[PDB]
Design an enzyme around this catalytic site. Structure first.
Site, PDB file in Angstrom:
ATOM      1  N   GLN E  11     -37.663   2.234 -16.400  1.00  0.00           N
ATOM      2  CA  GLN E  11     -36.455   2.033 -17.194  1.00  0.00           C
ATOM      3  C   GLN E  11     -36.193   3.215 -18.118  1.00  0.00           C
ATOM      4  N   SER E 130     -42.603   7.386 -18.635  1.00  0.00           N
ATOM      5  CA  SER E 130     -43.110   7.158 -19.978  1.00  0.00           C
ATOM      6  C   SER E 130     -44.514   6.588 -19.883  1.00  0.00           C
ATOM      7  N   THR E 169     -44.252  -0.818 -29.348  1.00  0.00           N
ATOM      8  CA  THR E 169     -43.722  -2.113 -28.951  1.00  0.00           C
ATOM      9  C   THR E 169     -44.779  -3.011 -28.332  1.00  0.00           C
ATOM     10  N   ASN E 196     -41.099   8.774 -29.795  1.00  0.00           N
ATOM     11  CA  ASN E 196     -39.886   8.205 -30.365  1.00  0.00           C
ATOM     12  C   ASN E 196     -39.786   8.399 -31.870  1.00  0.00           C
ATOM     13  N   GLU E 244     -41.721  31.716 -13.637  1.00  0.00           N
ATOM     14  CA  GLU E 244     -41.760  32.632 -14.774  1.00  0.00           C
ATOM     15  C   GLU E 244     -42.379  31.971 -15.993  1.00  0.00           C
TER      16      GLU E 244
END
Lengths: 439, 49, 76, 427, 429
Positions: E11, E130, E169, E196, E244
């Protein structure tokens, strides 16, 4: 290039800055929302706004000033008034709960939460621009944040900048006209920083401006707006030689060395001579030699002390307008002819003279007139020694019965700071004595 | 005399190219000014949004 | 609304001081109320054509910056 | 081949010297763009004493203009003849002196003195043979008197056998325009008696009495008082550029003049200075020009020299005149007046003539007098310094950056003898 | 010719890809219905005039994909790129690694084959994930392991959200964020880390906005990604490539965790008054209150910096800014890197989204640094791992879905190895 930074403190100092930035905006072409109003019209020869404005990327000029208050209500008239679209919204610093006529609140317990903000916003301003002639701050003695936070601002601003000059502007209590019973307790005790950490500290009494309006002008009942317009024409005359060129021009460095003899005698006066009602300017002449004889009149001083009792140490003269240099030198030797005008035995030279070509501007709705000539007479005088002689007597009369002390001592202030301030001003009553007698 | 005349002509030529440099510099400065005006315009538009 | 029409001028004054109508940020002449605080009298009226400066002598610094960029001359 | 370099110092020198190049270029016939459009033919023959060459036959003056504030350099560049100076030749600091001699000698100006000399060594490289430098400053302020002195004691050490010349605005006695004047003026004569070959005393109070009583002006501004000095600096060195009979250069006026090497403070004056109502009424003859030279009004220093004897006297005449009327008219001064002249020099007068007059006059002169009355303003400056220094009136503005106090009572040691040295040679 | 392929996992990846593909479609001329030579890096082109991107969206909840189908960008994607599982991983690394991901790992790798054979020569994948949730940790880990073994030398960029110190959370976040790294460390050729709480403080402080939602955070992440790959798409003076700055940036083969910083995050209100010079924003991106991961740089030596300037920049000013950065005596640098910096300059300014809270800025900087400050941002995760795993909470779900007890300890010694690598490379010489 040749700039200055105007730092305003307190309710008295903000309402000076409502009058100054009205009057610098009229002196250039700047509208109240920035916007140099030239529209597709060519022009050449400019940059007389680097001393008090900054031309940014969009073509909008934003001045260099921080507005500091511990009161919310005074500054929020600017945020909703006409000049809201001129100041950068980080530069109207607002406190949360006020000092309420208290040195100990404004210097020990309330300014601690706010001093981290202002010293970040000043350093943002000065890193931005090349040079710095010097700060020009505005405060008042008789109030909490006007003399508490000002005593904390100046101890911190003299460390991390140092060799850049400072000025200082004061509101000094009267003999008669007072507004607070805390007025002597904090006009004695604010001198522990305005002696060590100020390079020139100008002195303005409320009482003489209350009296200079009723006698030169045909005005009675003058309010606080008319006091701010007059002191706006002093700061716009000290700094006028930076912007608009002249035959003999003094910078902020130049009159500093010509006016203070020893480094604890930096308390000069100031006067503005051609103050006249706009009906009366039709009548008299206001010549080049008329308005310099008026600077030494006891009726037209700025602090209610008799000038016929002290001896003048130094004088700096700041002429403005269409002045010729032969007529200045005819004026000065006439003053040394008269023998009721007293100069110290080790100063035969006496004077410093500045001349600018820019005429003194008018303000709309202002009771000052339009006159081709003006002068602002700076002087260091022994007669201001007799002006603390009505404030030391109002301090020890307070202090013996220990009235109004328990507020200060409960906020991190010790009782050894009260009597330490009394000896440090009774010492200065001998420094203004010991340089008075002849050799 | 011939060498002197050649000197005068060549000096006049170089001052002509310097005048060209002056005019192109003024053009570049006005271009920068119109870029500043454009930035002010669309920033005002964003404020209206 | 045009100060070269009303007053004579030195011809090098900028357009900001030439045209006074652009200073739109000032107060807007509210009719008086009783709750009229006194410190708000500072800067309560916009400048008009009479109060604009006739002459202007500002200090340009463009040449001084564009010469003293870097360092001064020294023989190496 | 004998050329000079014209340094300008401070803000008072930039009003003098910017008016100095509008008088020389009037004489040599140069437009403000720098291209020759003149009348005569020997006018640019000796253009190289002052000026220089560039590409395409345009002439640039040589100078270096110093200041401690950037406002004056923009004012010079926007002047009437301000186009011809090279933009490399302007040097300036960023923070002003603030009327402090100590700031302009130690802390604010010493960053700049290492950059003026790089311009000076670039201009002195271009010479055939240098006659000597030239400087213009003011003994009342901070950046003319401090750093303008620090130029002198460093130029003289590294160019030891050149004829250094200065032009000094001596402070007024009492009609003054700075509170801290005597600290500024007594601390500069301490370094100006031992490093200059000639130095001129220009009162700003004798420069008003000229403009009231012999010119009868109405509003004497600064625009013409710079011109009265700038006619004397052109008048001394006319013999350098233009030919004539009995020429006398910038150096041969020094040898005849200073009898002992500490007495080189002169008092100048310009001979035909006539009111515009009486231009019809002056008679052009050589004796009428001489009575203006020795008149007490056209003295341009602060002391009347009838209070003592002249030591040596110059007269640099300009124009077309018989040199019998020159050498007889100076003799008639030394016999009618005899007590006013030093009697262990049997002839006190040096003369000179050149054939090219100033623009708009038939003839002109330039008086130079080494009078013994010049001790008088040395006493009045020193008495207004020993009243300040009784109880240290303004001293903390000077002491706090590194000048100790003994360099102030050392100054009056090197100043109260020079009052006396004129008195022992007085009689 | 220089193309890149994007995979959005979970998500967090889907919403970051939302904000991304809005930003790219408004940056080029392409309307969301795909209808209008620089699109070939990201947009395949049909014969009619439709532009279709190289993107694959995969999640196991059906909702996070079919609101992408319901929303206004439904016309752009081929409707087989939008891939949907049957049950979500329920914040479980083991369950997302094992019991759901095997069903559609074949479909997502076959779409990877079909898209990556519709190009000329690959440059590098961009996958987005994540480190807080089940599928976004574990299915991401299986995906990147299989893709690295299958492709080999083909470079990939992993984008990661770290769990913040005080912003969190879930509760199993130390478990899945230490169990992702053991086999998500050595198969990604580069990986980038944000969190966050830092973005919350930059939104609260620099911008004049209180109280933001994930939309603004995804807008900032899309700005940083566009700042990286605008040297591929749009040409300029000193454009750098992916290979690079990988060779310039990674010192040692397990120190491949650069930070992120993007300098002029300022509102229109402050941008209108303030000037913005490139020396000013060069200092402002090294301000220790403008970074994007909560590790204090004053504790950290900078192994490498690479700056990405976009807009009206000239090279003398960037070079003077580099010299005045190394001149300072309050910013630490590594004792064996005398060169320090890498510079890229683009000729196109940053493109502004409608409705976003930034300002259009004439000169922007995206700063990347490999710094030793980030080492002290793992000991908090290892201590939270200790506090959970000592009394052994929430392990039985993960081991009922399937594990042994020693694999979490294998992850623990992997993080101990990473801690000692970051400690030993930073010391003196």
């Amino acid at each position: 290039m040749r700039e200055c930074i105007s730092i305003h403190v307190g309710q008295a100092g903000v309402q000076i800055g409502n009058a100054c930035w009205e009057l610098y905006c009229l002196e250039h072409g700047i509208q109240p929302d920035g916007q140099m109003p030239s529209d597709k019209t060519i022009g050449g020869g400019d940059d007389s706004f680097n001393t008090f404005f900054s031309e940014t990327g969009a073509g909008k000029h934003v001045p260099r000033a921080v507005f500091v208050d511990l009161e919310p209500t005074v500054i929020d008239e600017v945020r909703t008034g006409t000049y809201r679209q001129l100041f950068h919204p980080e530069q109207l610093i607002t406190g949360k709960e006020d000092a309420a006529n208290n040195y100990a609140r404004g210097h020990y317990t309330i300014g601690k939460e706010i001093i981290d903000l202002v010293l970040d916003r000043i350093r943002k301003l000065a890193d931005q621009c090349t040079g710095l002639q010097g700060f020009l701050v505005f405060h008042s003695f008789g109030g909490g944040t006007g003399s508490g936070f000002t005593s904390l601002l100046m101890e911190r601003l003299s460390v991390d900048y140092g060799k850049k000059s400072k000025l200082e502007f004061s509101i000094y209590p009267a003999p008669q006209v007072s507004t607070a019973v805390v007025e002597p307790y904090n006009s004695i005790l604010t001198t522990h920083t305005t002696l060590e950490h100020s390079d020139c500290a100008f002195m303005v009494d409320n009482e003489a401006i209350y009296d200079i309006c009723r006698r030169n002008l045909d005005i009675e009942r003058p309010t606080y707006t008319n006091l701010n317009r007059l002191i706006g024409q002093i700061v716009s005359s000290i700094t006028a030689s930076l912007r608009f060129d002249g035959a003999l021009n003094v910078d902020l460095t130049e009159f500093q060395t010509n006016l203070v003899p020893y480094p604890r005698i930096h308390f000069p006066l100031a006067t503005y001579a051609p103050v006249i009602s706009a009906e009366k300017a039709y009548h008299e002449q206001l010549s080049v030699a008329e308005i310099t004889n008026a600077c030494f009149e006891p009726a037209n001083q700025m602090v209610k002390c008799d000038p016929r009792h002290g001896k003048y140490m130094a004088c700096c003269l700041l002429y403005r307008g269409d002045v010729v240099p032969k007529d200045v030198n005819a004026a000065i030797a006439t003053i040394k002819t008269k023998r009721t005008i007293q100069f110290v035995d080790w100063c035969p030279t006496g004077f410093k003279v500045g001349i600018n070509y820019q005429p003194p501007t008018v303000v709309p709705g202002g009771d000052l007139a339009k006159v081709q000539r003006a002068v602002c007479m700076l002087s260091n005088t022994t007669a201001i020694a007799e002006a603390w002689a009505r404030l030391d007597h109002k301090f020890d009369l307070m202090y013996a019965k220990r009235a109004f002390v328990h507020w200060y001592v409960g906020e991190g202030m010790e009782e050894g700071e009260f009597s330490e301030a009394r000896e440090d001003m009774a010492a200065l009553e001998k420094d203004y004595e010991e340089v008075g007698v002849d050799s | 005399y011939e060498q002197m005349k050649r000197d005068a002509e060549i000096e006049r030529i170089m001052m002509e190219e310097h005048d060209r440099l002056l005019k192109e510099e003024s053009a570049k400065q006005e271009r920068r000014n119109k870029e500043r005006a454009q930035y002010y315009l669309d920033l005002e538009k964003q404020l209206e949004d | 609304e045009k100060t070269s029409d009303y007053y004579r001028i030195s011809e090098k004054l900028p357009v900001r001081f030439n045209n006074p109508g652009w200073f739109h940020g000032y107060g807007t002449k509210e009719a008086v109320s009783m709750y009229r605080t006194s410190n708000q009298t500072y800067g309560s009226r916009a400048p008009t054509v009479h109060e604009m400066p006739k002459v202007f002598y500002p200090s340009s610094n463009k040449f001084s910056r564009q010469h003293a960029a870097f360092g001064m001359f020294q023989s190496h | 081949m004998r050329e000079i370099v014209h340094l300008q110092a401070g803000q008072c020198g930039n009003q003098i010297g910017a008016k100095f190049w509008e008088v020389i270029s009037d004489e040599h016939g140069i437009d403000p763009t720098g291209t020759y459009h003149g009348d005569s033919d020997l006018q640019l023959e000796r253009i190289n004493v002052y000026y220089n060459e560039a590409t395409g036959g345009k002439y640039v003056p040589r100078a270096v203009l110093v200041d401690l504030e950037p406002g004056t350099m923009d004012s010079v560049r926007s002047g009437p003849f301000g186009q011809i100076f090279r933009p490399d030749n302007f040097v300036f600091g960023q923070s002003g002196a603030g009327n402090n001699w100590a700031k302009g000698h130690y802390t604010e100006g010493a960053e700049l003195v290492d950059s003026v000399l790089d311009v000076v060594r670039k201009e002195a490289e271009s010479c055939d043979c240098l006659q000597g430098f030239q400087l213009t400053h003011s003994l009342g302020g901070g950046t003319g008197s401090g750093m303008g002195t620090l130029l002198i004691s460093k130029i003289r050490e590294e160019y030891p056998d050149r004829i250094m010349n200065t032009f000094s605005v001596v402070p007024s006695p009492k009609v003054s325009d700075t509170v801290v004047e005597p600290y500024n003026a007594t601390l500069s004569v301490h370094q100006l008696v031992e490093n200059t070959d000639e130095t001129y005393c220009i009162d700003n109070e004798a420069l008003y009495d000229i403009c009231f009583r012999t010119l009868k002006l109405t509003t004497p501004t600064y625009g013409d008082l710079n011109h009265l000095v700038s006619a004397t600096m052109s008048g001394v060195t006319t013999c350098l550029r233009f030919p004539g009979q009995l020429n006398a250069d910038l150096r041969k006026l020094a040898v005849n003049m200073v009898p002992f090497p500490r007495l080189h403070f002169f008092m100048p004056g310009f001979a035909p200075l006539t009111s515009r109502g009486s231009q019809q009424y002056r008679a052009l003859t050589v004796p009428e020009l001489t009575q203006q030279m020795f008149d007490a009004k056209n003295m341009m220093a602060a002391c009347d020299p009838r209070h003592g004897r002249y030591l040596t006297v110059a007269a640099v005449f300009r124009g077309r005149m018989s040199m019998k009327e020159v050498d007889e008219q100076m003799l008639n001064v030394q016999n009618k007046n005899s007590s006013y002249f030093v009697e262990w020099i049997p002839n006190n007068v040096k003369t000179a003539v050149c054939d090219i007059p100033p623009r708009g006059l038939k003839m002109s002169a330039t008086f130079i007098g080494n009078s013994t009355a010049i001790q008088e303003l040395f006493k009045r400056i020193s008495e207004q310094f020993t009243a300040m220094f009784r109880r240290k009136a303004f001293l903390h503005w000077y002491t706090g950056e590194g000048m100790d106090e003994m360099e102030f009572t050392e100054a009056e040691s090197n100043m109260n003898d020079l009052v006396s040295e004129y008195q022992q040679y007085q009689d």
